Design a protein around this ligand. Structure first.
Ligand SMILES: [Cl-]
Ligand SMILES: [Cl-]
Ligand SMILES: [Mg+2]
Ligand SMILES: [Mg+2]
Ligand SMILES: [Mg+2]
Ligand SMILES: [Mg+2]
Ligand SMILES: [Mg+2]
Ligand SMILES: [Mg+2]
Ligand SMILES: [Mg+2]
Ligand code: NA
Ligand code: NA
Ligand code: NA
Ligand code: NA
Ligand code: NA
Ligand SMILES: [Sr+2]
Ligand SMILES: [Sr+2]
Ligand SMILES: [Sr+2]
Ligand SMILES: [Sr+2]
Ligand SMILES: [Sr+2]
Ligand SMILES: [Sr+2]
Ligand SMILES: [Sr+2]
Lengths: 160, 95, 140, 154, 186
RNA sequence: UUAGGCGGCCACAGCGGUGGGGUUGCCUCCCGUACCCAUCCCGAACACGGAAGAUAAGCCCACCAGCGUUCCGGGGAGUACUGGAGUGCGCGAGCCUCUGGGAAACCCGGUUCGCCGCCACC
RNA sequence: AGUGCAAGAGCAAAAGAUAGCUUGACAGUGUUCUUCCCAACGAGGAACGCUGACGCGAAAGCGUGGUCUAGCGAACCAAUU
RNA sequence: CCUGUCAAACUCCAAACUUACAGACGCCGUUUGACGCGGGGAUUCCGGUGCGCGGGGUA
């Protein structure tokens, strides 16, 4: 199913699990990557991937962008490299599909997505000055798998 | 509305803010009003009886007499004049 | 300062928690006054589905009745530190509970302007072990 | 005292907004009225802000417009110093202009129509699709701005 | 106290001094209330009316100011209670009050009690108060007889301070005799 | 108000804590069951009767802010949101300008450890 | 928590629990609102009165069924008082 | 303790705004009689579009 079908916030918030059943499981494998035993404060560099437009990101997209990003970090820094990345959003919005013409059209449940306002940080990484360009590259690959244009913003980092 | 009973859609207006929860002070349930007096109508969630139809919450009527211990208050619902039977507990003097 | 702070016995409650009574008779002799039926709450698999129904009996003693009982009941037990409340109460044994408190305990038992007894005026396990131990027996 | 001039017609304007103008005695495009600066009147102009041009005019400007567009409560009789003197509590237009600006009287009080029926603006106005700050002619004007408008519509 | 949503009882409820449910029912009469109260040593009767910023006491009598008319006996018994009511009642009549409803606060409606004695007193004073005769102690007890006979089982004076040995309900009579009299400075 | 009773508002009054106060005065704790009355058993309570003792509870007085609450300053914020207007921008979801309104969280500093009414009373 | 049953709402010296007593789940007749916002429309419903007769309570007072909003039915005809 | 997120059928908070009544100003009415009341006659009970707010639906 194309994202054009759900990328916009054109419907009420639909998240009440007490009134919604049959919600598919999330495809997101992890929200905290790298050395999660360590704190984000122990790093000199913090870089976030900022969304430029308000949108809904299906869990299938979060998994792919997160995957293609962390995967790069693992290849360039190792299965235990000194870094840590976080996906701060969770797919709370339940999605439907009307799959009988327009009669009794309320759709059956088919997935979940996370609503992201423009300007918000979807991902945030923490690394050493060395692996700074490796994270900027992991993000370049990640925003290629999510609807909106993004800004790769570097927070703590005056080592330019 | 899905139904049309008297309490349809009255969740908020007939619910007490947590701190005003519990038996209400007797003073206002015994207050006396005179004919001609302007009184705001507002049901007190804690008081069961002596209520008027929730649709009238927020009206500012005029006392024109009483029936037993309740008051007969005149209001104008839209363009129509109506007499409401209501006890002091759900009334407040205007101003 | 001490006369109104030195402990005392509010009540001695003797009770036999059975489960279906005929035992009321012995409590009436060992204490000196009539016992009371004991009803239960909630249904229980152990053929105890009847909400209200005899299941036990107790006798609350106060004043002399209380002491005259402990003078022959206390020697029948081996009191210990753990066997005491956090309020300064203890029960041994047929159960035998001793409720100890300070003078003006009425402040929390009267109808008008009742009030909760301040923690400072609340008896303590230590202050309790003393009082009792300081009267015909030993502690732990 | 602010001078109000309707610059946008009634078609498609909210009814409550249109009734407000009428209460302010303006029933046509280009019609002008003088309103005291009270809290009550303030709400009214604020509500009609998008279909009018308003501001405080200079004594000289008010005088020019009164001479050229003031009218009796009834009749075609001209309104000049002599008319003013023979009909109002003032000796000439100036006395009237000053009393109006200082809000001591109203056109009606002096037997004059509450409305000044102005002429279209000579050389056109700045447009009715934008406010003053954006280069348009709508909303609150400068005394010099209101004067430029009122004079072009003398 | 716990948080924003916590509900604290009305002050007079915390203090355990006002039964608001009984109060409301009391006020529904539209009549003044004969507030009967007690202390370990004294008894007080007040005629209260409703007001804008709180209740208004129109008249009242304390057992203490009973001596003010020739009372040398204790002030926490039946005779004292009755007379205290009557005194308050008389004063009530003075201020224009003609009827009332017995408000016994958090006291118990025990038959023959003092709050009921206060009521019998206030009623004889001329005040119209809804009551029930067979809930009022019999005359003699009001006089204080029950205490005289208790002193009969002497061996040791009932009263420490010397007011008398065998006590006197006849004193009760003298005082009521003095109160029902016109002269009396109220 | 050198301690009381009935209240109104119903946490600005809650929670917790410190200090002070009573020979025939007040409230109590307190002493005591012949009576009225009382405990499905207990004068515990309720009720009655009373002063040997006490200020340790309660209560009243003075006060502390750690928690909770009220209001206020400064910051967040004229932000978020928004009534009216636009041949303003954007592929579009949407955004912007002008006009009139305008938060919430949170942080820092203050306020708040009740206010008021009637009656009685060294 | 409990309060018969949906949901939302009400309730703590109670509207919950226990005990005891009781039959107001009563008769007559209205006011008002609702049904049907505004704005006419029946049955049905509710709140609030007056009259009669009662229950309980010291008494104020409470009881026109169950804390509130669902549990309902024209004319003709029959049976019944 | 710290750290990451939410709600059409959540709310310790809380707008703009809508709304009852009243006063003030404005406007209007007392020969153009308003407001209100009684009576005669209808037509009408397929609507549509823009804008704002929506709910359904990939649209
Ligand atoms: Cl109604
Ligand atoms: Cl009392
Ligand atoms: Mg709502
Ligand atoms: Mg003319
Ligand atoms: Mg142009
Ligand atoms: Mg002390
Ligand atoms: Mg375009
Ligand atoms: Mg048929
Ligand atoms: Mg039949
Ligand atoms: Na079909
Ligand atoms: Na309440
Ligand atoms: Na039993
Ligand atoms: Na003390
Ligand atoms: Na009907
Ligand atoms: Sr939609
Ligand atoms: Sr993209
Ligand atoms: Sr005792
Ligand atoms: Sr497109
Ligand atoms: Sr402002
Ligand atoms: Sr009911
Ligand atoms: Sr609305």
């Amino acid at each position: 199913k194309p994202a054009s079908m759900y990328r916009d916030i054109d419907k009420p918030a639909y998240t009440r699990r007490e009134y919604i059943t049959g919600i598919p499981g999330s495809k997101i494998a992890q929200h905290k990557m790298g050395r999660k035993q360590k704190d984000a404060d122990d790093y000199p560099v913090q870089i976030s991937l900022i969304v430029e437009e308000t949108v809904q990101l299906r869990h299938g997209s979060l998994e792919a962008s997160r995957l293609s990003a962390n995967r790069h970090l693992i290849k360039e820094l190792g299965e235990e490299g000194d870094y840590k990345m976080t996906l701060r959003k969770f797919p709370h919005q339940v999605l439907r599909e009307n799959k009988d013409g327009m009669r009794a059209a309320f759709g059956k449940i088919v997935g979940t997505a996370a609503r992201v306002q423009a300007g918000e940080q979807l991902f945030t990484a923490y690394c050493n000055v060395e692996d700074a360009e490796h994270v900027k590259e992991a993000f370049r690959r990640a925003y290629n798998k999510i609807t909106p244009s993004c800004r790769i913003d570097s927070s703590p980092a005056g080592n330019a | 509305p899905s139904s049309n009973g008297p309490l349809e859609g009255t969740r908020g207006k007939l619910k007490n803010k947590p701190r005003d929860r519990g038996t209400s002070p007797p003073q206002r349930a015994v207050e006396e009003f005179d004919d001609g007096e302007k009184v705001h109508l507002k049901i007190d969630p804690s008081v069961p009886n002596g209520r008027f139809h929730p649709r009238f919450d927020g009206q500012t009527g005029t006392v024109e007499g009483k029936q037993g211990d309740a008051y007969k208050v005149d209001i104008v619902d839209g363009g129509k004049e109506k007499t409401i039977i209501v006890t002091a507990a759900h009334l407040r003097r205007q101003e | 300062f001490h006369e109104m702070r030195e402990p005392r016995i509010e009540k001695v409650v003797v009770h036999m928690g059975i489960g279906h009574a005929n035992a009321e008779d012995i409590l009436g002799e060992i204490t000196g006054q009539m016992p009371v039926r004991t009803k239960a709450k909630r249904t229980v698999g152990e053929f105890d589905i009847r909400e209200g129904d005899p299941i036990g009996a107790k006798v609350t003693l106060r004043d002399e009745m209380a002491e005259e009982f402990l003078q022959t009941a206390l020697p029948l037990a081996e009191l210990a530190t753990s066997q005491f409340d956090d309020t300064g109460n203890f029960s041994f044994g047929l159960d035998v509970t001793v409720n100890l408190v300070r003078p003006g305990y009425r402040v929390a038992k009267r109808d008008k302007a009742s009030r909760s007894i301040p923690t400072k005026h609340r008896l303590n396990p230590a202050d309790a072990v003393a009082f009792i131990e300081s009267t015909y027996d030993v502690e732990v | 005292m602010h001078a109000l001039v309707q610059l946008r017609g009634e078609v498609n304007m909210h009814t409550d907004i249109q009734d407000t103008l009428e209460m302010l005695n303006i029933h046509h495009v280009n019609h002008c009225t003088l309103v005291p600066e009270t809290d009550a009147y303030r709400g009214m102009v604020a509500k009609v802000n998008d279909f009018v041009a308003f501001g405080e005019p200079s004594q000289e400007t008010l005088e020019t417009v009164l001479a050229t567009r003031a009218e009796p409560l009834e009749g075609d009789a001209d309104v000049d110093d002599e008319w003013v003197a023979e009909h109002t509590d003032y000796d000439d237009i100036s006395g009237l202009a000053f009393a109006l600006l200082s809000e001591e009287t109203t056109l009606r009080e002096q037997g004059l129509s509450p409305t000044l029926r102005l002429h279209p603006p000579r050389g056109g106005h700045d447009g009715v699709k934008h406010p003053v700050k954006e280069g348009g002619q709508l909303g609150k004007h400068d005394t010099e701005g209101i004067d430029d408008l009122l004079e072009a519509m003398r | 106290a716990t948080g924003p949503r916590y509900k604290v009882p009305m002050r007079r409820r915390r203090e355990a001094r006002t039964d608001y449910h009984q109060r409301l029912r009391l006020l529904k009469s539209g009549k003044p209330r004969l507030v009967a109260r007690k202390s370990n040593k004294h008894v007080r009767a007040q005629l209260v009316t409703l007001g804008p910023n709180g209740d208004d006491t129109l008249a009242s009598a304390h057992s203490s100011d009973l001596a003010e008319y020739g009372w040398e006996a204790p002030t926490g018994n039946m005779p004292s209670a009755y007379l205290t009511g009557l005194l308050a009642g008389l004063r009530a009549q003075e201020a224009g009050v003609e009827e009332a409803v017995l408000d016994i606060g958090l006291n118990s409606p025990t038959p023959g009690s003092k709050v009921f004695a206060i009521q019998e007193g206030a009623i004889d004073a001329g005040l119209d108060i809804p009551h029930n005769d067979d809930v009022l102690a019999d005359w003699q007890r009001t006089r204080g007889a029950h205490i005289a006979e208790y002193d009969e089982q002497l061996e040791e004076p009932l009263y420490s301070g010397d007011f008398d040995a065998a006590d006197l309900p006849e004193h009760f009579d003298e005082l009521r005799e003095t109160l029902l009299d016109g002269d009396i400075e109220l």
